[PDB]
Amino acid sequence: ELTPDQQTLLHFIMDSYNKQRMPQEITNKILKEEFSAEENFLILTEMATNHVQVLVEFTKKLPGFQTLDHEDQIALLKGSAVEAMFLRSAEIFNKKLPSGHSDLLEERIRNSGISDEYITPMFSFYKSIGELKMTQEEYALLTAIVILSPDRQYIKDREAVEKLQEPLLDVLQKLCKIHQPENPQHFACLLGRLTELRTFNHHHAEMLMSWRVNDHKFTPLLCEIWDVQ
């Protein structure tokens, strides 16, 4: 329960996760801008493209991330980008983070040209993950685990990622069995949600299709990480 390799590992990750990266100036638009399907889409695009950068900076500061193959570093980023955004947005909605402006963020998502087919599942996820009543520590560790996934397609040296992920998985279990002796199945719950997170990759590809055919444009950065061809 909390060794010296782990107490220091965690603090490095929470120090990263807490590095207030998303500019207030930017996130403030969620609240202050006009509400309409076009403006809702534009604001969400700006959040996502900014968030990708925040993700890259947080990823970089992950232990032993920079010691990886360059081609694998990209496959992990492109592979986890969406799942990481769902985690951060989830935290917004569940933790009511001031910077996120939960209720208005929800207004914008619910009117940005996203089919009910995806809206329904999306917010179902949000509700269930909230019912986990996770801590910021958990939110941070889950994000780190998702980013460092050896399942990602096109990956070459999978075992090397597994080597960076395993330690993080263990620390998370430690925070589950220790802080939650009440129910040891808590760690299994978290992992369960991860599978659920994965489902949104397909949903997201279809959301992009629909936006695209309706003449919506994304940023160079998002076009690249999402392969918007």
Partner: peptide, 11 residues
Amino acid sequence: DHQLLRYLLDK
């Protein structure tokens, strides 16, 4: 390919 990401990683 994927130059923008390599640029952010090296930044």
